[PDB]
Symmetry: D2
């Protein structure tokens, strides 16, 4: 949190926009013939930018909701802020910025599943298979990256760089 | 919500105090030799009073925590617990169980956090209106099909401060 | 949080019950001729036991509500859980377990005051004038104690002793 | 909530994108020489999209935080901020201001935490329905008295994902 560093571009703004466009088309095809109500659920705070760009590329009538989970050395996954709307009998797509361990995301899916939605999938922008500690079903993935320390596009470093339009790598000096 | 009514006594303060003492001895005897941390989890708002009196009758070192749930519809968490319950003996403390919809869903959520044991203690039980068969190990009173008030329990945000359990009787 | 210790009785269960009875009579006289709706507001978690005993000794029709404030090195006072009901045009009595610095309580009163209640008073069970860092108006006080490390009656020590029916002092060994 | 209607365009995506770029340069020029930490505070849910596009146009190192408020009645905090704002330049990011009741009360609450500066940036402003004179330093569009949807803003939880601002037109 307190180290001399700099930031290089890893995934340019244009690459993200192109990849999200594709994701939008995939998500659209998977839920266009569903009929039931659909809702995209974002995990604050990292997902807000990804959510904003993604939901615009989804050509299906859907709702947008958010929830906040507890961040932590091993502790219970607690809900700091639940969803505003109901999800039972609905198509729910959890929208994440990045999956590493998948601990929090695994628990969140369990909690949501109890509310018995019609379907329940996960869409993450970044994925680190390397750091996975729990196997979680992830239907849509934007980028698979090695264990690199990335920032930008909602992802922070000591609350910094959330507003970068590009995914960047931090170089410790 | 604005209906003319009266409140008759159903369970006097002395009866509650005595029954809670008994519940205390039973809860104590169950968890006294556990060797794992114990926590009483109250469901706000209606159970604050029951919780305060109950934990004072529980002669084992335990923690006290609270949780606020919502409402048919989905059961959402307005205020989650403050502390972890993983590997702990958890006792859910609820004021009253009518249908059991809320308890059922709250127990599910907490069970996901893998506590050593998960049990429920309710002051009032109204089995004539149960829709879901939830398992309760401690019950203070099984009551008739009456709309009860007092002791944390309210009627339109009214009567929570009554030291006794009463029943609402509407005028004709 | 990790020290060898023991607990002695400082304020017996019976003394608390007697003092709360008196508080109930005072509070009752101050608000019996008000007319407006009344609500007792408790600060979780320390206030739950004090709230339960106090509201029963208040012979005035009132509502009971709770809220949780952020606990922390100097940080913003944040609301982890707000009130469930409205308080504008009402007689509001904040119910606290203990006042030391009065930092959190001062901010909480400010936040609540913005909602424009008819009146706004504070009732605490214990008071340490010694440790006061901010001057806060406190209309009702159960006990004034010196700077002693107390537990019990909702007050904890590493989440312990909340359930003690008596106010106790911890003796570090 | 269940009324038959249509959605006509009021502000096209290109117009929003261009206007947000301008807002970006203005916000940047104001806070570029502050020397104090900056934070954009969004009011959920309706402002997530505006926030995402806006902060990408703000060329100063800042933090992004969110807050959920309620609704007449009292304005309560369902979800408070995650980080402190004391001694920081705070910019409240809101989707639309009709009456201004919520903004007015939210600004009051945040001001209590004594930030270095407290300002408001709204995408849409509908002054024909303002009940409280709240001070806004940045406004994307001042709009006619129409029920707008899209770009985070909803009609009965619908249309939040539209890349443009539209207006709801009921059928006769
Ligand atoms: O490369 C990173 N940059 C910044 N943060 C992180 C994290 C920690 N974490 C992000 C931080 C969450 P926050 O402190 O913003 O609430 C990712 C965990 C997602 P998962 O448990 O479901 O897999 C993991 N990797 C990174
Ligand atoms: O006899 C009763 N007296 C008063 N209330 C009730 C209820 C409803 N009450 C208890 C419901 C228990 P459930 O039927 O879910 O098993 C819910 C109120 C929660 P809130 O005040 O935070 O909104 C059910 N029965 C009674
Ligand atoms: O003697 C004590 N025992 C246990 N805790 C404490 C505290 C800390 N604090 C109690 C701990 C609050 P918690 O960590 O349970 O959320 C009292 C602050 C009240 P104020 O700021 O309005 O004056 C101060 N004194 C004691
Ligand atoms: O033109 C509009 N389109 C859509 N909605 C609105 C509103 C109400 N909308 C904005 C209110 C702003 P205010 O009038 O307080 O200045 C409140 C919805 C909050 P919620 O979705 O979390 O419950 C006011 N105007 C419009
Ligand atoms: Mg995330
Ligand atoms: Mg209950
Ligand atoms: Mg306190
Ligand atoms: Mg808004």
């Amino acid at each position: 949190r307190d180290m001399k560093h700099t930031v290089e571009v890893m995934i340019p703004e244009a690459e993200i926009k192109a990849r999200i466009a594709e994701l939008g088309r995939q998500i659209t095809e998977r839920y266009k013939d569903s009929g039931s109500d659909m809702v995209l659920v974002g995990l604050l705070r990292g997902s807000f930018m990804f959510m904003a760009d993604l939901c615009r590329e989804v050509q299906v009538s859907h709702e947008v909701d958010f929830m906040t989970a507890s961040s932590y050395t091993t502790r219970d996954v607690k809900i700091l802020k639940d969803l505003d709307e109901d999800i039972r009998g609905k198509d729910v797509l959890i929208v994440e910025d990045i999956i590493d361990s998948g601990n929090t995301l695994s628990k969140v899916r369990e909690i949501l599943s109890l509310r018995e939605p019609k379907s329940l999938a996960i869409c993450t922008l970044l994925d680190k298979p390397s750091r996975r500690e729990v196997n979680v079903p992830v239907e849509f993935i934007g980028f698979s990256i090695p264990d690199e320390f990335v920032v930008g596009y909602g992802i922070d470093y000591a609350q910094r760089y959330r507003h970068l339009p590009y995914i960047g790598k931090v170089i410790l000096l």
